[PDB]
Structure 1
Amino acid sequence: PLGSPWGSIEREFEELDTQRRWQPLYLEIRNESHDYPHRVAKFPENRNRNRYRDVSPYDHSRVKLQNAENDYINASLVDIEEAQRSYILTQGPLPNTCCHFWLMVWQQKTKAVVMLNRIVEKESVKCAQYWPTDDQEMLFKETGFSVKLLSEDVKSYYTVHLLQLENINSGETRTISHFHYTTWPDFGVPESPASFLNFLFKVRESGSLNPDHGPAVIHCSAGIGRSGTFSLVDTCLVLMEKGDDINIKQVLLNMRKYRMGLIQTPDQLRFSYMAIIEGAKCI
C-alpha cells in the first residue's frame, strides 16, 4: 500500500515471528556464508594484532596501512555499491594497535568513528582506551599521532566525543566525531529500536557519512556482531530510498563477503528487521 514503504519487510517480519523461524533463518545465513582467504591475518608476525583468533579480515577486502613495514590491521572495507555506502568494520583496538587504528583513520580520511561496545563488558576488557577521557593528550609515537578530547556530549544511551587527531610529523589536525553507543550488550541488542534509531540518525545528521569524507570506521569488540547489525540497518534504510522491495537476507549475505560473521545472534537479526521497519516509519 501507498503510504507503507516498510510493508513487505513488515509482512516478512510478522511471518517469521508467527512461524518462529528466526533461528532457522539465522542458520540459513550461517550455512550459506562462504569462507574467503584470510592468509595475511594468520601470519605469525600479526598474531598480536588480532583480538580474537576466530575473527579475521578477508585478504581481498582488508584495509592496508600504507607506508608501513607491516601493513596489517584487523579491519575490513565493506562496500555496498547499490547503496553507494562504504564502511570500515574493525575490531576494538588492542593497546599495541591503537597507533595503527589512528593511522588508518588518518589515511582513509575518516570523519566518524562509530563505537558500539563498552571498554569493559561482563568482567572482560573488550577494547583498549584509545581516546583520552580528560584534557591530557594521548600520544601514539609508533605512527606519529596525538589525540585530544575537544568536547563530550553525554546522553542517556550514548555519548558523542569530538576528538582532535593530529599528525605529529605534518602538523595537520582533523576533528573526528566519536559516536559511542554505551547501552548495547555484547551478543545482545540495544535497549530499544527507538534508542538505536536516534543514535543512527545523529550519526547521519552529522554529515560524517557524506561522500566527500572517507568511510566511517565502525567497531564493537570483534567488529562483526554489533558492528554488522548497525551496518545492515543503515545500509538497508539507504537501499529503501530507491523504492524497491529489499531482501534483507541477501543484503547481509553480500555484506558478509567483505567481513565474516556479521550479525551474531538470531535476536540481532530480528532486531535488524525491527529497526529497519521502525526507522522507515520515523523517516
Structure 2
Amino acid sequence: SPYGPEARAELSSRLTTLRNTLAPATNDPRYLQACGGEKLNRFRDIQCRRQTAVRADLNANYIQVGNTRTIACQYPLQSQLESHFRMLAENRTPVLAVLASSSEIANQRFGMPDYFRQSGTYGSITVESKMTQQVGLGDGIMADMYTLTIREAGQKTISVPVVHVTTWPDFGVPESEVTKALASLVDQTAETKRNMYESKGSSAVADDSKLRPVIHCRAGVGRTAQLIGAMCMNDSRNSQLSVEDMVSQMRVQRNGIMVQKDEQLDVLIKLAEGQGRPLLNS
C-alpha cells in the first residue's frame, strides 16, 4: 500500500507536473543564460537554476535536500575546465563523485574531457592526478579513486578526493545495492576530508556554501540525482523527509529533469521502502 502501485503512480503524477512546469523557456529568468554565445549547457534542455548557481559560467547548482548539502553539476565542457577546477578548490571539495563511465569519457563524440585521471594545465591552474585505492561496490562495479591536487599561483593549493564509478550496474536490486554502497563510500570519503580541514581550523567549516560533495555524471540529472537522494537518506538529520520532498527539492534547485528516468526514481523508492521512509507528503 504505502509503496504499492497507487502510491507510486501518485508520486509520479506529482513529480511529472513539477517537471513539465520547470521546463525552461527561451531566456527563462529562472535559469542561468549563456554569455554572448559561449556554450554553457552541455545539453540544450538541461539548464542550471540561476538562484542556486555556483558560478556564472558553469552548469552547476547548490542543492540542499533536507539537511544534506551538495553541489550537482554537468560534466564540465572543455572550455569550462579552469572555472570548474576553481570551483572545486574554492569549495574545499571533500569529495568529487564522477558517475560517468570510462567508456563514455573515452567516446570523443561526447566531448567529456578526462580531467581527473590525467595531469594538465588549464589557464592559470595546474592539476596533478594520483590514483589511490580501488573499492568494489558490488556486482562487479568498481570505484577508482584519485587525489586531484589543484595549484594556482597566489591561491591555496587544494587536494580533492575523487570517486569514479567506472561502469554502471543493471536495473534492479543490483543497482539499489550498488547505490547504497556508493553513497556510503562518498559520505565516508567526504567525512575523512572534512575532518582534516576541521583539525586544521579551516574557516571553510563555518561556511555552508563550502565543503560540499560535488557530484556529476554526463548531464548531472540522472545517476547524479539518484546518488544525491541515496546520500540524503544516509543523513541522520533527514528523518521523515519524503521521496516527494527530496525530488521536488532537487528539481527546484537545479532543474525539472533531476531524476531523469523511471528506473532512477524506482531506486529511490526502493531505498525509501527499506527505511520505512514515506514516498508522499500527507
Name the SS for the 2:253 alignment partner. Answer: coil
1:78, 1:89 within 8 Å by CA — same for their partners in 2? Answer: yes
Alpha-carbon distance in structure 2 between the residues aligned to 1:128 and 1:178: 15
1:255 to partner: Cα distance: 2.2
Aligned equivalents of 1:268 and 1:190: distance in 2?
Answer: 12
- Are 1:127 and 2:112 an aligned pair? yes
2:35 alignment partner in structure 1: 43
Give the partner amino acid of 1:37.
Answer: P
**Pair 1:209–1:259, CA change in 2 (3 A):** farther
In 1: Cα distance, 2:111 partner to 2:217 partner? 8
Instruction: Tell me if structure 2 keeps the 8 A contact 1:26–1:265.
Output: no
Alignment of 1:130-169 (within 5 A): 130-133=115-118, 137-140=119-122, 142-153=123-134, 155=136, 156-169=140-153
- Alpha-carbon distance, 1:56 to partner: 1.1
- Residue by residue over 1:27-84, the C-alpha shift from the partner in whole angstroms, topping out at 9 and shown as x without a partner, is 430212443734532433332x3211111111111112xxxxxx4111011123x42x
Aligned counterparts, 1:78-97, within 5 A: 78-80=63-65, 82-83=66-67, 85-97=68-80
Residue 237 (structure 1) shift? 3.5
Letter in 1 for 2:219: A
Q: Secondary structure at the match of 2:220?
A: coil
Change (3 A) 1:279 1:147: farther
1:32 paired to 2:18:
yes
* TM superposition shift of 1:129: 0.7
Whether the 8 Å contact between 1:126 and 1:221 is mirrored in structure 2 is no
How many pairs are equivalent? 251
- How much has 1:115 moved relative to structure 2? 1.1
Alignment root-mean-square deviation, CA: 3.1
Contact preservation (8 Å) 1:115, 1:219: yes
Rounded Cα–Cα distance in structure 2 between residues aligned with 1:275 and 1:264: 17
**Alpha-carbon distance in structure 2 between the residues aligned to 1:275 and 1:163:** 30
Letter in 2 for 1:184: W
Distance 2:34 2:169 in 1: 28
Contact 1:190 1:196 in 2 (8 A): no
Aligned mates of 1:279, 1:143 — CA distance in 2 = 47
Distance 1:195 1:169, change over 3 A: same
Cα pair 1:153 1:160 within 8 Å, conserved: yes
Does the 8 Å CA contact 1:158/1:179 hold for their aligned counterparts? no
Counterparts of 1:190 and 1:54, CA distance in 2? 31
- 1:239-258 aligned at under 5 Å gives the runs 241=237, 243=239, 245-258=240-253
Q: Which amino acid aligns with 1:151?
A: T
- 1:3 corresponds in structure 2 to none
Identity %: 17
Structure 1: gaps (5+ residues): 1-10, 65-70
Determine the structure 2 residue equivalent to 1:6: none
Which letter maps to 1:254? Q
Aligned to 1:75: 60
Name the counterpart of 2:158: 174
Q: Compared with structure 1, are the counterparts of its residues 39 and 192 closer, same or farther at alpha carbon in structure 2 (3 Å cutoff)?
A: closer
C-alpha displacement of 1:242: 5.6
Aligned-pair CA distance for 1:218: 0.6
The DSSP-based 3-state class of the residue aligned with 1:175 is strand
- 1:92 positional shift: 0.8
Kept in 1, the 8 Å contact 2:73–2:216? The answer is yes
Structure 2 CA distance for aligned equivalents of residues 147 and 234 of structure 1: 28
Question: CA 1:199–1:279 in structure 2 vs 1: closer, same or farther (change >3 Å)?
Answer: farther
Structure 2's unaligned 5+ residue stretches are: 23-27, 196-203, 278-282
Partner of 2:168: 184
SS in 1 for 2:112: coil
